[PDB]
Amino acid sequence: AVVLEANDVDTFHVPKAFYEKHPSKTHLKDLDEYKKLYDESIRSPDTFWARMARELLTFDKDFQTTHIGSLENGDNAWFVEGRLNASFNCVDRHAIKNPNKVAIIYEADEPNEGRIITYGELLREVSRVAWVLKQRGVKKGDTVAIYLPMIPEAVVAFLACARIGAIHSVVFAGFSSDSLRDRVLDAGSKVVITTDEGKRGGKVIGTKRIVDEALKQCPDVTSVLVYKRTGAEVPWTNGRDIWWHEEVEKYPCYVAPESMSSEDPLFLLYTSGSTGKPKGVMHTTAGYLLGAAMTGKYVFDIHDDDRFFCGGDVGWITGHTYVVYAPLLLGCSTVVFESTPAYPNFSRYWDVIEKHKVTQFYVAPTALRLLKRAGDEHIHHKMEHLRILGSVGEPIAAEVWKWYFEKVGKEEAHICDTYWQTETGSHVISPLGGITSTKPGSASLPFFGIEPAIIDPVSGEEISGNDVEGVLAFKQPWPSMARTVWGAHKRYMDTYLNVYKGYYFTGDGAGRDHDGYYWIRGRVDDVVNVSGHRLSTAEIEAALIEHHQVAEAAVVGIADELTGQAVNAFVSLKDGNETTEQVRKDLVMQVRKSIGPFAAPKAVFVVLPKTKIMRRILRKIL
């Protein structure tokens, strides 16, 4: 009984109403077909992933070799001779079948201020922005920084970069000017797409003013594409800044999509790591797109006429994979939500679902716990078409699971706790919608092409059998796996492939129970997740140490109901001219200037245990 977190927890089947209220049948017949297809995906993956790639993707030129490389050397290449384009698979091929089919369902910050975009309209707007970038010097292989909020213009900026072969480096709207500047210089981006101002939950985000303050140290940026979101008077540097609505009307509504290799870099997504500077994880085209289409088809049970809603932001891989690519690849409607879960009221999430007849909802448990405390007077909507409920970022608690199952799902929808990371590109351990039975707090079985292993951290040896515990690792590579860390492959190898040779190291502790289910126990390294943002404790410590009156700094993350994790900072202060309260206030703002407002610590305590600072003694006292 080594796995104590699985003691007495029971299996939860798919509700009988799921099958009764289903428009069609699910993609897999039963649980055995999963096992049959899963064992095929790990025994002979070369034949498996080849059949899947041609069913879900349409290539310019066919491929011959499914996979070469290994995890030992970090030289993985998938579908090496194939050629394709991301914009074609997301827009063009669906617009060819029927251009009047809905692609994007835009729900603006204020209710009843959105719009509905068809695949034909999406192809035109993507083609126009593609032309604007081409006429601004964007060539194949260049990087473009996307500093946009959750407006439909963000999805257009994604595929416009992919249509011409550019590499889009999306920066979460709300990072400080210093964070944006660093992500621009590291990727060498010469073009940046942004808005004049942002509108989230009634508050205004001065995006354009942040970009201006960031570009003061980014000289190589020569083009800024600004979209008029609020129309407020914003600083304008002429010759460099250009208005979206002005430049868009100059160029044709169609452009030919650049043929890309399977292993051409598709995008960069900068992810905070265990140490040093935030590193830009890279994903190629064919493998990543196949990962998104596969998980959408089998985890979320996405069909043609479905309406998909993911609460994640585009600044995160959740919005990358499941707001943009996975739904559009499969040809359904994706909901682009610009507001907060509690604006103007706590029923907003469900207001959108009922209005747009959403079939699949994807939320973080941190947002569920906040709405659960508010009261059940807000969730009185029928939400008749809600079929798959998804959680991400943390294991869903048994009490939160029941609320998600009864109030939202009406005891008729399948809850899927999906475990994955930015470097996985898509779900790796998750239940299959309408197939896999679940356990509250467990991520259920692994996905196709995911061979998980429990590793003894001290011994570095794999622990076989069930009812085992250790750290989580993958034995063989999968198509969606990240290919490198931009500008630092050595850092990529040491972080993910040199910890346990022949394995991919997730950086999480895990356990496997008697039934074979997996239980994610959280990060092993110095990494925390606050409000959906992945932060490094070492990075926050460096910002605090920069203060002239901070001798040393120590930051540790503990559990928190409001934001998943809470960053608590221990600081040592020399004598100074201003009091501790002023320094305490000045220490929080200093972190906001380096990283952002969300990186602000919950509390700072002027105090230092050492032998090497013991993080455990600092956490346990809290």
Ligand SMILES: CCCOP(=O)(O)OC[C@H]1O[C@@H](n2cnc3c(N)ncnc32)[C@H](O)[C@@H]1O
């Ligand atoms: C994909 C969400 C955002 O991705 P990021 O790369 O920012 O963070 C991934 C990490 O979030 C946790 N995590 C994510 N999903 C779960 C999950 N379902 N259960 C437990 N922990 C989870 C795991 O520690 C993981 O290494």
